[PDB]
Amino acid sequence: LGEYGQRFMWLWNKIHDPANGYFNQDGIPYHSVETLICEAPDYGHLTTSEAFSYYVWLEAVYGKLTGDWSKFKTAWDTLEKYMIPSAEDQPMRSYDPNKPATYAGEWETPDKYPSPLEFNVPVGKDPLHNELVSTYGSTLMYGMHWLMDVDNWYGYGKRGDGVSRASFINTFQRGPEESVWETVPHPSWEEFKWGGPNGFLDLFIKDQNYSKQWRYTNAPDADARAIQATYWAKEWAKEQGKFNEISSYVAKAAKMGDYLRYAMFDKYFKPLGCQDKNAAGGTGYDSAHYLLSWYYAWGGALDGAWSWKIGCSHAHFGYQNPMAAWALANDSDMKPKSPNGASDWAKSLKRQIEFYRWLQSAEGAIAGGATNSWNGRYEKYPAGTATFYGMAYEPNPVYRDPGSNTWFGFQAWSMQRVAEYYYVTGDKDAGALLEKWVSWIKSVVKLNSDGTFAIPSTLDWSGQPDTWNGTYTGNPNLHVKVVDYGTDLGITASLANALLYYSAATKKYGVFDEEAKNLAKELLDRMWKLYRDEKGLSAPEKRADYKRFFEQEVYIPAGWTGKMPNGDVIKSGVKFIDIRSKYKQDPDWPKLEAAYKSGQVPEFRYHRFWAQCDIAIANATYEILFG
Numbered sequence: 001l002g003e004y005g006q007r008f009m010w011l012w013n014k015i016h017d018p019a020n021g022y023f024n025q026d027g028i029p030y031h032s033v034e035t036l037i038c039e040a041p042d043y044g045h046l047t048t049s050e051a052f053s054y055y056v057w058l059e060a061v062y063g064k065l066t067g068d069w070s071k072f073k074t075a076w077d078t079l080e081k082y083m084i085p086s087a088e089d090q091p092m093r094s095y096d097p098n099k100p101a102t103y104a105g106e107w108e109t110p111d112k113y114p115s116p117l118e119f120n121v122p123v124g125k126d127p128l129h130n131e132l133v134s135t136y137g138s139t140l141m142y143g144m145h146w147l148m149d150v151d152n153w154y155g156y157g158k159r160g161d162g163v164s165r166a167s168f169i170n171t172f173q174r175g176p177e178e179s180v181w182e183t184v185p186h187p188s189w190e191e192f193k194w195g196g197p198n199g200f201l202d203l204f205i206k207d208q209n210y211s212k213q214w215r216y217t218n219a220p221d222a223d224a225r226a227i228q229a230t231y232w233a234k235e236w237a238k239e240q241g242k243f244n245e246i247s248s249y250v251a252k253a254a255k256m257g258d259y260l261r262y263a264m265f266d267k268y269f270k271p272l273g274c275q276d277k278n279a280a281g282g283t284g285y286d287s288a289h290y291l292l293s294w295y296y297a298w299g300g301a302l303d304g305a306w307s308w309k310i311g312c313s314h315a316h317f318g319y320q321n322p323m324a325a326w327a328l329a330n331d332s333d334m335k336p337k338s339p340n341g342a343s344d345w346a347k348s349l350k351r352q353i354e355f356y357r358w359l360q361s362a363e364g365a366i367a368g369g370a371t372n373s374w375n376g377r378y379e380k381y382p383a384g385t386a387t388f389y390g391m392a393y394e395p396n397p398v399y400r401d402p403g404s405n406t407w408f409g410f411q412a413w414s415m416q417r418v419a420e421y422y423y424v425t426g427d428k429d430a431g432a433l434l435e436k437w438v439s440w441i442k443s444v445v446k447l448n449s450d451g452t453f454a455i456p457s458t459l460d461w462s463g464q465p466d467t468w469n470g471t472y473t474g475n476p477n478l479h480v481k482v483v484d485y486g487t488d489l490g491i492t493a494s495l496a497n498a499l500l501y502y503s504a505a506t507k508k509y510g511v512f513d514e515e516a517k518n519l520a521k522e523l524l525d526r527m528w529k530l531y532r533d534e535k536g537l538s539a540p541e542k543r544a545d546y547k548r549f550f551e552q553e554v555y556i557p558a559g560w561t562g563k564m565p566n567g568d569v570i571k572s573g574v575k576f577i578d579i580r581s582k583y584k585q586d587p588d589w590p591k592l593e594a595a596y597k598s599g600q601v602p603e604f605r606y607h608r609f610w611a612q613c614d615i616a617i618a619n620a621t622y623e624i625l626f627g
């Protein structure tokens with residue numbers, strides 16, 4: 001191994017040293033080593049399907065670089081055992097594909113919840129269910145639930161037992177203004193053992209009566225990442241004559257891909273462009289946007305009296321993955337077993353790439369995405385709204401606190417997958433898209449004289465794209481603005497990765513963009529010079545938002561009372577920390593509390609698992625492509 005592959009092995013070893021504490025005792029990676037953190041998960045020893053995806057990717061690269069596929073197989077084994085709900089977790093009975101769910105609106109503020117079920121709103125047909133049951137002989141949905149309480153910190157345990165590790169939980173339920181700070185963490189398996197008389201159900205959905213039930217929520221970007229990772233694992237293992245070793249792992253990915261088509265459908269299977277909650281439901285694929293939406297979700301009564309499935313009407317460019325889509329569409333090893341799996345993915349591949357191109361700003365950054373459900377209630381679009389196969393442009397799909405596309409990290413994460421795609425296929429549209437985004441990137445990244453660097457941290461947006469008609473117009477009235485800069489190391493690494501794939505691609509298919517490679521190499525080297533530490537790499541970051549631990553009110557309706565597993569009482573007026581009193585026993589709590597009582601912005605040096613993974617993988621990627 002060269003210099004870069006050595007950097008990978010160094011960080012890999014830091015990640016896998018059990019004294020460093022990246023993984024729990026079951027081998028499940030945590031969101032971060034440090035427990036005091038709040039940003040998407042609200043505690044650092046939760047974990048995410050995202051973390052698991054990065055774990056698979058990390059070990060794929062380990063296989064490439066060492067010839068040893070045991071790390072990859074173990075990563076998948078743990079993913080499947082713990083993060084995919086098992087048969088007993090998702091006992092689905094009495095599903096009706098002609099009636100997939102009952103509609104409820106999305107609402108602008110958390111105080112509008114619980115959202116009423118509206119029983120007359122028509123819901124469309126689910127065209128996947130029968131095919132998948134016929135294909136696999138099961139109602140089991142093979143996809144990751146997004147959020148896990150790894151060491152049962154919240155107390156829900158496994159299927160209501162209050163004690164087991166790897167406890168499925170959820171948070172976000174109450175629309176676009178429910179920040180990470182404004183949620184009520186609740187179990188996926190609802191037995192009424194906590195919360196109120198109806199457990200947590202009646203904070204979120206208003207119904208005439210309530211039953212015990214389960215539900216899970218997929219994060220399609222993560223599942224798609226895990227597929228992307230697996231594609232490279234099988235390419236890299238075939239190069240070594242080790243295909244059969246990972247053969248069964250490639251099949252898991254192909255199956256994950258098959259179920260991940262639920263992410264391609266409107267929430268309530270309503271036709272694209274309907275702009276009316278009272279319109280008739282779709283009859284098949286007229287409700288497919290063929291994008292990786294923000295989620296799919298599924299549920300069932302513990303009875304077996306009913307079950308349900310939803311997609312999502314909102315798509316963010318940040319979620320898309322042309323590399324996974326291409327693999328499922330075109331690579332015979334990754335072909336899903338269903339009749340329509342691969343064809344559906346080929347449609348999604350092309351729709352995705354058009355989506356990215358439609359959202360490309362005048363400068364080259366990618367704008368947020370689009371919705372088939374304006375305001376989350378199938379409203380009529382404002383006059384003058386730009387559209388994409390009948391979906392309305394949104395600058396900040398799904399969330400507004402903060403705006404989902406104010407985070408520059410989507411640029412890197414998502415464009416990295418397009419750069420891999422372009423590297424493999426030479427697709428001209430993907431190349432033209434990349435060339436303009438790379439041009440923007442070079443103009444915004446700061447390489448300081450003193451050897452430091454900064455990348456955009458927050459973005460803001462103005463205007464709209466032109467309505468899509470199959471070709472890119474330049475979007476001269478759509479603008480990005482860089483609001484501030486930072487040293488997010490996971491994102492920096494991800495951007496270097498994107499730039500490396502793109503550069504390698506231009507060498508194969510056109511004029512070698514050597515500057516792109518050099519910028520990538522500068523970022524990776526300056527980072528390595530500056531930010532190594534005992535557990536991997538970190539850079540200081542200020543978290544002024546952490547005032548919200550103490551100050552953020554969590555909406556609870558007047559008159560509703562319940563309890564968390566540790567006895568914390570849930571009622572009107574409670575703050576973030578009031579329903580998470582165990583935070584006060586965190587090792588860093590005294591530090592934060594003193595910083596807060598004292599008027600000062602706390603500062604942290606985090607080891608996020610995904611970031612350490614992105615770092616390792618980007619350094620390895622230099623070796624694989626250019627060494």
Ligand SMILES: OC[C@H]1O[C@@H](O[C@H]2[C@H](O)[C@@H](O)[C@H](O)O[C@@H]2CO)[C@H](O)[C@@H](O)[C@@H]1O
Pocket residue numbers: 039040041050407409488490491608
């Ligand atoms: O939700 C997207 C993404 O966010 C990650 O946290 C960000 C946070 O959103 C941003 O405001 C902060 O400044 O930087 C961190 C780290 O990049 C979170 O780590 C991811 O899990 C999540 O997918």
Ligand SMILES: OC[C@H]1O[C@@H](O[C@H]2[C@H](O)[C@@H](O)[C@H](O)O[C@@H]2CO)[C@H](O)[C@@H](O)[C@@H]1O
Pocket residue numbers: 099100101102103201205207213299306307308310
């Ligand atoms: O439509 C099947 C079934 O749905 C039940 O409501 C579900 C709804 O479909 C789901 O999307 C929502 O988020 O969760 C609730 C369950 O709390 C409904 O109560 C049943 O009567 C209906 O048969």
Ligand SMILES: [Ca+2]
Pocket residue numbers: 177178179182401
């Ligand atoms: Ca809010």
